[PDB]
């Protein structure tokens, strides 16, 4: 038409050897992905999910899941679609009997005061919402009207029951409470009782106690086996060094959570240079336990990348004592005052300590 892209189909091979723009080099500097984000919200994107109908069958899971504005859209549209469909049916049946024709005769209409589709819709309001305005009566004239009245009553009761259920399971949600648990932006490593450990701090804001709390702790790192079995995300469990031997915790004050680095702990070969900005390593802290009021189990997901782990710092003591009762100064929550410590690895430290003890004794 008006382009010249088809006139010349030839080519020239004189110009070649064009490369090295250096533009893509800056693109490779983009930060790598985190497993779970700080405020929970796990950053995993499932791919090639074969739906096979397992994402519509559990309808009442979805209805609770959805946001409140979407839930109110479904709420409003369920009721209004039901009202309007049954209004259509009332209009049609009262029209078939002739009660819509004005001044038809003394024939007793099967539903009085039906003089429009507008009054038919108002009549559907009165029936289903169970309001019953005296103007629009249901007479004993035609059997189909009584059948349809029964059906609409049963359907209205069922729809009310379903919406009551979903509102019940939505007003007892948990994600409005998972965010009111507070971790540090960054975790620290320091020696306690002469042994290296990986500290952390977690606290609660709402006065409502969290019952039967539970703190799982995992390391996320690609790791191979001697047999060549490569696992991209080989999660490893870690004990919480709690004295009793269980991992349960009674959370009132901001407590210090840490795992003692014994020979079992997979962090047994960490060095202060081995946890730099781009190092492949990530700690997860799953804080479980129910909400005291509603009795709904909750999680508080959080992570700590390599470039957040900080060597040789101790959390500032947060708890003080006021005149009558204790004090908690949450401004000093994540502050980690410097503390000198040996800069070697956990294995080198253990071997050196063993050799020194053997030589001394």
């Amino acid at each position: 038409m008006l382009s010249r892209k088809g006139i010349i189909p030839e080519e020239y091979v004189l110009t070649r050897l064009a490369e090295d723009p250096t533009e893509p080099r800056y693109r490779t500097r983009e930060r790598r992905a985190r497993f779970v984000s700080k405020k929970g919200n796990c950053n995993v994107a499932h791919k090639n999910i074969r739906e096979q109908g397992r994402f519509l069958q559990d309808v009442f899971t979805t209805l609770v899941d959805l946001k409140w504005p979407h839930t109110l859209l479904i709420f409003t549209m369920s009721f209004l679609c039901s009202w309007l469909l049954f209004a259509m049916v009332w209009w049609l049946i009262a029209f078939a009997h002739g009660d819509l024709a004005p001044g038809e005769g003394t024939n007793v209409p099967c539903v009085t005061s039906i003089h429009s589709f507008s009054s038919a819709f108002l009549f559907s309001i009165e029936v289903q919402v169970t309001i019953g305005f005296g103007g629009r009566m249901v007479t004993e004239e035609c059997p189909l009207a009584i059948l349809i009245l029964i059906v609409q009553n049963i359907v209205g009761l069922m729809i009310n029951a379903i919406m009551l259920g979903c509102i019940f399971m939505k007003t007892a949600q948990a994600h409005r409470r998972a965010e009111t648990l507070i971790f540090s932006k960054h975790a620290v490593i320091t020696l306690r009782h002469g042994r290296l450990c990986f500290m952390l701090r977690v606290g609660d804001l709402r006065k409502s106690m969290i019952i039967s709390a539970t703190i799982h702790m995992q390391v996320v790192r690609k790791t191979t086996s001697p047999e060549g079995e490569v696992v991209p995300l080989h999660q490893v469990d870690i004990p919480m060094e709690n004295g009793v031997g269980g991992n349960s915790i009674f959370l009132v004050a901001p407590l210090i959570i840490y795992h003692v680095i014994d020979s079992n702990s997979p962090l047994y070969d960490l060095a202060p240079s081995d946890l730099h900005h781009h190092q492949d390593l990530e700690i997860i802290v799953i804080l479980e336990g129910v909400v005291e009021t509603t009795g709904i189990t909750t999680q508080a997901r959080t992570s700590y990348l390599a470039d957040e782990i900080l060597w040789g710092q101790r959390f500032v003591p947060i708890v003080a004592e006021e005149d009558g009762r204790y004090s908690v100064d949450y401004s000093k929550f994540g502050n980690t005052v410097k503390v000198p410590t040996p800069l070697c690895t956990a294995r080198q430290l253990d071997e050196d300590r063993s050799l020194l003890d053997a030589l001394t004794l």
Binding site: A45, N48, Q52, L56, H70, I74
Partner: protein
């Protein structure tokens, strides 16, 4: 639309087009055109009377909306291979067909005849509904989920099973292959992240 706002599954999910998918869409279009024609007749006929005569186009005015919702509902159930949910859509076609067939034969009662436009449009729309109902029961015939035996369902094509097939032109719902609608999201990526061999 609620699961869609959090559809990371559908972020890189897979599809399976039901049998007779081409003929389903082309029939929906071949009836959307004649429903627009019926709307034109309705707006045109009442020009002689002093009452609006809503019963000439508002039936078709809701038929057009119903057809659009029907095709939307069929595509949704096509992405999620959950055919048992289309029973409602199935009954709709046969139910709608029955009602309009009465209207057709009623014109034949009064000797309306093809010489009037409404008879032509109604006849064409009736045979289109017959073919569409044929398609709706074709789905039953193949997949047989309502039948006694186990549903002889098929897995998604191995061409799309691979992660790295980002040129979804051979297998996409017919009204997103005429207009290349699947391209739209890719173009957003072009603005965001440069389009290189990755």
């Amino acid at each position: 639309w609620g699961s869609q706002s959090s559809k990371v599954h559908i972020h890189h999910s897979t599809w399976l087009h039901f049998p007779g998918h081409n003929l389903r869409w082309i029939l929906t279009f071949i009836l959307l055109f004649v429903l627009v024609c019926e709307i034109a007749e309705g707006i045109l006929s009442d020009g002689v009377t002093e009452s609006r005569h809503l019963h000439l186009y508002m039936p078709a005015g809701m038929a057009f909306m119903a057809a659009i919702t029907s095709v939307v509902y069929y595509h949704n159930i096509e992405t999620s291979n959950f055919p048992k949910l289309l029973i409602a859509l199935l009954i709709y076609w046969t139910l709608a067909f029955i009602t309009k067939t009465i209207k057709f034969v009623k014109f034949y009662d009064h000797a309306i005849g093809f010489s009037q436009l409404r008879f032509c449009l109604t006849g064409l729309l009736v045979i289109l509904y017959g073919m569409l109902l044929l398609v709706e029961v074709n789905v039953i015939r193949v997949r047989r989920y309502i039948f006694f035996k186990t549903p002889r369902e098929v897995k998604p094509p191995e061409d799309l099973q691979d992660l790295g097939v980002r040129f979804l032109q051979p297998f996409v719902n017919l009204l997103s292959k005429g207009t290349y609608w699947w391209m739209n999201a890719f173009i957003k990526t072009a603005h965001k992240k440069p389009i290189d061999l990755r």
